[PDB]
Structure formats: structure tokens, C-alpha cells
From a paper:
HBsAg exists in three variants: large (L-HBsAg), medium (M-HBsAg), and small (S-HBsAg) surface antigens, all of which contain the amino acids of S-HBsAg. Small spherical SVPs are protein–lipid complexes formed primarily by S-HBsAg dimers and are the major format used in prophylactic HBV vaccines.
This map was used for model building of the HBsAg dimer core. Although it was predicted that HBsAg contains four helices, we found that residues in the last two predicted helices form three short helices (H3–H5). On the intracellular side, instead of being a flexible loop, the CYL forms a defined structure stabilized by a CHC2-type zinc finger motif, with C48, H60, C65, and C69 coordinating a zinc ion. We found that mutations of cysteines on zinc finger (C48A, C65A, and C69A) abolished the surface expression of HBsAg, while cysteines mutants in the transmembrane domain retain robust surface expression, suggesting that the integrity of zinc finger is essential for HBsAg maturation. Interactions between the two HBsAg protomers involve multiple residues at the bottom of H1, CYL, and H2. N40 also makes hydrogen bonding with the T37 of the other protomer. These non-covalent interactions stabilize the HBsAg dimer near the intracellular side, complementing the inter-subunit covalent disulfide linkages in the AGL on the extracellular side.
Residue numbers in the entry:
A (entry chain B): 9 to 50, 58 to 110, 150 to 226
B (entry chain A): 3 to 50, 57 to 110, 150 to 226
The structure:
């Protein structure tokens, strides 16, 4: 009795995972428009779910595949985070006792700061911003969500004059 | 002296401008490419005129917010991809010291070796599928190409039995009961 239920649950969860790409590419295709789907060029079916006869269906499958690939990658990265959180990646820090946790992250950041040498200047600013934002981060996300495209639109006309006087500054 | 002295830094300025303007549009190119994948390789129109493509919304159009979002999202992925690439490069030089599971550090692909060894350790059944894959390589390459092409031909036929798929767990479950 138990094993039948276990197998049914496993199959249903596998179906959920396999249909995730449907939902995800449908969401992204919604992003293309003002939050609303469309109709595949050629019964007017959305290009996120075409019938097998529809030519776009072939494309859809390819699309479903790529999304799925990214998902796995994300999952992998997510997995790769947890191990790094738990300190199961015994990465030797640049010259020694091991970093109990986040060894990979600390090593990677140390290497980047040591080599690129401008992230050294960037890090103080980012640390300032994050530390000063226990809750300000939430508000600036809201501002970015609303004003961010707007401020980008206002800065963009002066976006190309920006390199000109940046060059002037570099000359001086 | 003065001529070349000025041109040098200014040459760097011009080259930087050109490279940044060529490489900062890649989010737009990839967004347009995916939107093309959505409709058999075509642009279509936005919801808002001149019928501009939805990946090049003017600021007046309401989609410029929307577009930016996905453009930004695409931009993020690029960094991630780049990061992967960067990692995929560093491991080759062995610049990632990862101690192997129980000792000298691996000369190259240390991170890849540790990850694969740990993953194989965690799942015993996974390795069971490894040999057949090699056999797939070990089989006739032409046979593998024919199989893949038939699957492409059988993809629509693959899901032509998609409706019977749902009962698959029950009947197999029934087998598990009778097993
Ligand atoms: Zn279609
Ligand atoms: Zn638009």
C-alpha cells in the first residue's frame, strides 16, 4: 500500500518538474508583452503551448529545452551554494587552516580583489551600502522597480555625453 | 610627441567607447533572438506608433519598463555565464585548490574532480547509467546519429502517446504491487 503511494507521489512530482519549463517560458513570453500572452503566428494558440501539428511546436520544444537547461544550471548553482555555505568545499585559501564556512566564496573574492585591484575600491562602497541598508534595501528595490527605468531614461540622453567628459576627466 | 601623446590616451578612449557600445547591446541582441525563437524566427509587434519591435521599445511606450526588466534579467544571466566561463577557465589552470575526498592538490580540474567525486559518492545508482552512455559512444556513431534523428522524427510521435503517459505510474505501480 505504501510503495504505491510513494511511486504515485514521485511520478506526480516528476511531472511538476517536467512542466516547470512550460510555466517558465510562458512567464518570460509574458514579459515580452505587458504581462499578457500572445497567439502563435500559425485555432489561435499561444506560442508557449502549441499543438503538435503547429509548426511553432518544434521551436517551442527547443525553447522548452533551453529554459530547462538554465533551470538545471540554477539548481546546480543553488546546490553549489549550499555546500559552500556548509563548508564542504575544502578550498585552500590563498597564502593553512580551512575556512569552516563559505570557503569557496572567500577564496574567489580574495583572488578577484588581489588581481583586478579595482574591486578593492568597489568593495568599501558596496559594504557601506549593504550595512547601511538593513531595511533601506527594500525601499531602494521599490524605487528601482518604479523609478529605475525612469531615471535610466533621464540619464540616457546624457549617457553618450558621459563618455565625452569622462574622456575629458581622464585627459586631466 | 604631442600628437601621438594625445592620440594614445584618446585612442584608448575611442576604443573603450566602441567596445562598450558593441558589448553593452548584447542583452538587446539576445532578447531579440529569444523573442524570435518565440515566433518561428520573427519580431512581431508590441502592445503600444510605427509598430516597434517589443525588444526595442521607445521610452514613451509602456513596454520600456517591461523590456528593461527582461533586458536586465538577460544581462544578469550573461554575468552568470561569464562567471561560469571564468570558473570553467580557472579550474583548467588549477587555480582552484580543492582538496580531494579521502594529499597533493590536483594538478588541473581540481574543482571538477572534487565535485564529480562527491556527486558520485552521494548517489550510488547514478554511476549505473555511466557505462551505457559510454556504450552509446562505443556503439556505431552512425547508429547514434540515426537514433537521434529518428527521435527528432519521433518527438511528435513521442508525445503522440503523451496522453497514455499519465496512467504510466499507476500500471507500473500495479506492477510494483504484483512484483
Ligand atoms: Zn504555435
Ligand atoms: Zn512597446
Amino acid at each position: 500500500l505504501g510503495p504505491l503511494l510513494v511511486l504515485q507521489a514521485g511520478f506526480f512530482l516528476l511531472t511538476r518538474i517536467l512542466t516547470i519549463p512550460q510555466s517558465l517560458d510562458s512567464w518570460w513570453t509574458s514579459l515580452n508583452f505587458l504581462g499578457g500572452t500572445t497567439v502563435c503566428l500559425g485555432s489561435n494558440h499561444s506560442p508557449t503551448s502549441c499543438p503538435p501539428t503547429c509548426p511553432g511546436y518544434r521551436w517551442m520544444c527547443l525553447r522548452r529545452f533551453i529554459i530547462f537547461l538554465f533551470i538545471l544550471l540554477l539548481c546546480l548553482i543553488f546546490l553549489l551554494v549550499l555546500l559552500d555555505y556548509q563548508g564542504m568545499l575544502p578550498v585552500c585559501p590563498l597564502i593553512i587552516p580551512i575556512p569552516s564556512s563559505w570557503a569557496f566564496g572567500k577564496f574567489l573574492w580574495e583572488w578577484a580583489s588581489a588581481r583586478f585591484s579595482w574591486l578593492s575600491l568597489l568593495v568599501p562602497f558596496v559594504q557601506w551600502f549593504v550595512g547601511l541598508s538593513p531595511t533601506v534595501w527594500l525601499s531602494v528595490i521599490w524605487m528601482m522597480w518604479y523609478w529605475g527605468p525612469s531615471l535610466y531614461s533621464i540619464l540616457s540622453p546624457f549617457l553618450p555625453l558621459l563618455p565625452i567628459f569622462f574622456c575629458l576627466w581622464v585627459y586631466i
